[PDB]
């Protein structure tokens, strides 16, 4: 019985932005969650709808892994029923969530000399994101009452903004890699279990 490639998402040399959060499908393997909970390398390991102790000796049909990078101050927003620029516009979680959230510091990897301005985030949307929805649209946002046919102007700006991610930053503005596991059991055989 092959193990789950979890070191494939947690040790993924590159991560994605929040407006384009990568999604992995994990199945046909055995996963040891007790190793990840006691790793002491994650600053935040919060679970919803599932007891992490009882999570190891449990089975699911398909588990999704969403990975992205945010500010330290915005790790609070990756949770069910949150409000903010991330939860409303970047990555939303459903009220009936049955998956965990795992975040850790990544200053050495995602912040270099002179800054690392390659991670982006959504700043404007005409409506809030639905649960597990993604929006990568670079359509200029109509902040005012005057329309704009995809042309920059007053009250019409680019909806994407880059993080600073300087090495000598504060913790709340430091790069933090976060992976959200989704535990879904549909009408299918359970194939991801633990020891």
């Amino acid at each position: 019985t092959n193990l789950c490639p979890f070191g494939e998402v947690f040790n993924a040399t590159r991560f994605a932005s929040v407006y384009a959060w990568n999604r992995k499908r994990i199945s046909n393997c055995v996963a040891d969650y007790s190793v990840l909970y006691n790793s002491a390398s994650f600053s935040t390991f919060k679970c919803y709808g599932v007891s992490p102790t009882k999570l190891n000796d449990l089975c699911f049909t398909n588990v999704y892994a969403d990975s992205f990078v945010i500010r330290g101050d915005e790790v609070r927003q990756i949770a069910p029923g949150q409000t903010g620029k991330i939860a409303d516009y970047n990555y939303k979680l459903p009220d009936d969530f049955t998956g965990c959230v795992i975040a850790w510091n990544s200053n050495n990897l995602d912040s270099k000399v002179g800054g690392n301005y390659n991670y982006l985030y959504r700043l404007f949307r005409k409506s809030n994101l639905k649960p597990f929805e993604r929006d990568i649209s670079t359509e200029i946002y109509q902040a005012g009452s005057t329309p704009c046919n995809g042309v920059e102007g007053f009250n019409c700006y680019f909806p994407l903004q880059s993080y600073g991610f300087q090495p000598t930053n504060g913790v709340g503005y430091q790069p933090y890699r976060v992976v959200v596991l989704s535990f879904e059991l549909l009408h299918a055989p359970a194939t991801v279990c633990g020891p």
């Epitope: 994605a16 932005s17 384009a20 990568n22 999604r23 301005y117 390659n118 991670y119 982006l120 639905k130 929805e133 993604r134 929006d135 990568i136 649209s137 670079t138 359509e139 200029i140 995809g150 042309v151 920059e152 680019f158 994407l160 880059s162």
Partner: antibody, heavy 117, light 109 residues
Framework: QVQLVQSGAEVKKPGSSVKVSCKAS????????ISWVRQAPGQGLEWMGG????????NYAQKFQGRVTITADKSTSTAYMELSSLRSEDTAVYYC??????????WGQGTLVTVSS | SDIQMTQSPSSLSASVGDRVTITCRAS??????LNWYQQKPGKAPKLLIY???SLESGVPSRFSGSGSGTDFTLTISSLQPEDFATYYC?????????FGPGTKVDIKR
């Protein structure tokens, strides 16, 4: 009035590299992204990569790392897609296209790239 | 894991004045992030309809898109001699960007 002009067709030996240029005009550069897709002879469209000139962030397809690098020159309104260590499978016509977020509304002329021994 | 796009039918044959309807399906839900492109031999693709529901500038009104989640359909009110070409659907909801196999359209005889 949006219009994109690509470089001329080039012939390369296997293992060499090619650099396709694309000059955009008729619209506000840096306010839109730019993408690249190739079409093999008698086959579908295969997305190469996408780059946003606003922040220079580049994203490539699943297996084009170490092979493709897409750059953008904001001053010249020109985006350059470069594919190295070319093989016979990579022979195709490469299309430059103004890339909005969830769609592509304006396409370039294309540049045929033939790589044979 | 990426996302694959499928179309149907693989090849259709109709004539001028007919009502042609093409379909497109995705692996995972993409909401309103599907686009349709028309490519003629020797030329580049043109954006027919963006967001799977809205019409793009310079496209006649006979073109119409619909769908949500994973199922989408592109329909034409009446076919025209300039409408005979190959059509594709793409997803703009995630990375990497993926297209469909394609759908060729020729005139009936």
């Amino acid at each position: 009035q949006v219009q994109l002009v690509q470089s001329g067709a080039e012939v390369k030996k296997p293992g060499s590299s090619v650099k396709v240029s694309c000059k955009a005009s008729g619209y506000t550069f840096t306010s839109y992204g730019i993408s690249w897709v190739r079409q093999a002879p008698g086959q579908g469209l295969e997305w190469m990569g996408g780059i946003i000139p606003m922040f220079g962030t580049t994203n490539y397809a699943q297996k084009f790392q170490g092979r493709v690098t897409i750059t953008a020159d904001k001053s010249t309104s020109t985006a350059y897609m470069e594919l190295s260590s070319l093989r016979s499978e990579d022979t195709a016509v490469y299309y430059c296209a103004r890339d909005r977020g969830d769609t592509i509304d304006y396409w370039g002329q294309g540049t045929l790239v033939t790589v044979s021994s | 894991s990426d996302i694959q796009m499928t179309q149907s039918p693989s090849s259709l044959s109709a004539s001028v004045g007919d009502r042609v309807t093409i379909t497109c399906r995705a692996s995972q839900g993409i909401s309103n992030n599907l686009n349709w492109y028309q490519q003629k031999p020797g030329k580049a693709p043109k954006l027919l309809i963006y967001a799977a529901s809205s019409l793009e500038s310079g496209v006649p009104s006979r073109f119409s898109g619909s769908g949500s989640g994973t199922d989408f359909t592109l329909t034409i009110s009446s076919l025209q001699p300039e409408d005979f070409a190959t059509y594709y659907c793409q997803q703009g909801n995630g990375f990497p960007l993926t297209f469909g196999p394609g759908t060729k359209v020729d005139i009936k005889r």
